[PDB]
Amino acid sequence: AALTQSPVSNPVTLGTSASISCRSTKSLLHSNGITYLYWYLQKPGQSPQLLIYQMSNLASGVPNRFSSSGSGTDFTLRINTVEAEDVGVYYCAQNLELPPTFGAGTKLELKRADAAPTVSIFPPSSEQLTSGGASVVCFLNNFYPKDINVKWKIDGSERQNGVLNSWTDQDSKDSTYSMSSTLTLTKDEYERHNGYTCEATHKTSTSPIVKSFN
Amino acid sequence: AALLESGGGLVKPGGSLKLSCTASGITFSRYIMSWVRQIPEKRLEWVASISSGGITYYPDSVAGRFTISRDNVRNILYLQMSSLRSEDTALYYCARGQGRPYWGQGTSVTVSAAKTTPPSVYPAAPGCGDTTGSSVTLGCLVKGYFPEPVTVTWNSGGSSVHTFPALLQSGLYTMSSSVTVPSSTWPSTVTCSVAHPASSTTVDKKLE
């Protein structure tokens, strides 16, 4: 029995309702009148949380903004008045027959007002340079949408090569995104140059927000 | 009513491991008990099931390497894993899937050759040469630790926190965490606590 959901929902406005579809290749309705479809949520760095079971029952602690409707093969997870903490991935799954199968998950997209990233850079700490090795770090916190590009300029020059980037998922309170950009290089390389620039071009704000130090 | 998985940890390829599952409020002998695992990709994968009748079930991927068993007297669920492959690396969950599903917090299994390495923590602070005003962003850089599970905590009190996903670099994990607070309170000591259980280590840093 295969369960299929889209990977993402259309962006949703806070306070409005959200709909998450799901379907099964076989009816989940059993001769006893119960429909063995259950839903659960997966938040970043957390264990899955049961939301609904036997199609229309709420697990414990689950607000009544959540509801599930549908037939034996087609289902919708309804979320009244979406709240910021609702972000995460929603999975439908079945517990009718032994080989347990799960849907792929539908990520709930939170639509909000555009926001500029608060950039800040930091020089390698002494402790780091000591043990031989230097990494320069800068944060682009609380911006929106998540579409953004960052560039590094060592002495005002093209760099790349030794730069690692990491993103956070949509924030559970602000509904924004944050990013980390690290440029790692030997204690030698670092000592040489002295003009390090963290440039963030928020593709929806113009005037590339930048930071650098010497 | 709770399920508790136990037994995971580091193990080298080809090795064997035995996971256990105990519960409060659930009588294992009455149901089809199961083990499922979450691979980093994030999709759940069925591992094994045993009926109240004692009939065992397994998907081809583990058919003869894993054994699920139950102790009806002490009420313990077992998962004996053998000939472990790196692809078996995951969070293993114990679960009662019939009716109202129940599963535990999960236990992490890592099939690797690499050796445990505690994390190096470097305080990330501004200094001299940039903007320093209302709400300054501080942070801690955690570098060079292997077993990925690490926990960053700031003075056990703060929401303006941002912990980024750990990235692998040269076979070793590295990640950073930032926190923002009003400049009108920097002289109150900011501390980040990095805990890495796979080494029993846990470093603390006072920014500035």
Ligand SMILES: O=C(O)CCCC(=O)Nc1ccc(/C=C/c2ccccc2)cc1
């Ligand atoms: O005999 C029958 O009616 C069929 C029984 C099918 C069954 O055991 N189902 C079943 C087995 C395991 C699960 C596990 C679900 C889960 C969900 C989230 C996190 C971790 C685990 C869910 C359902």
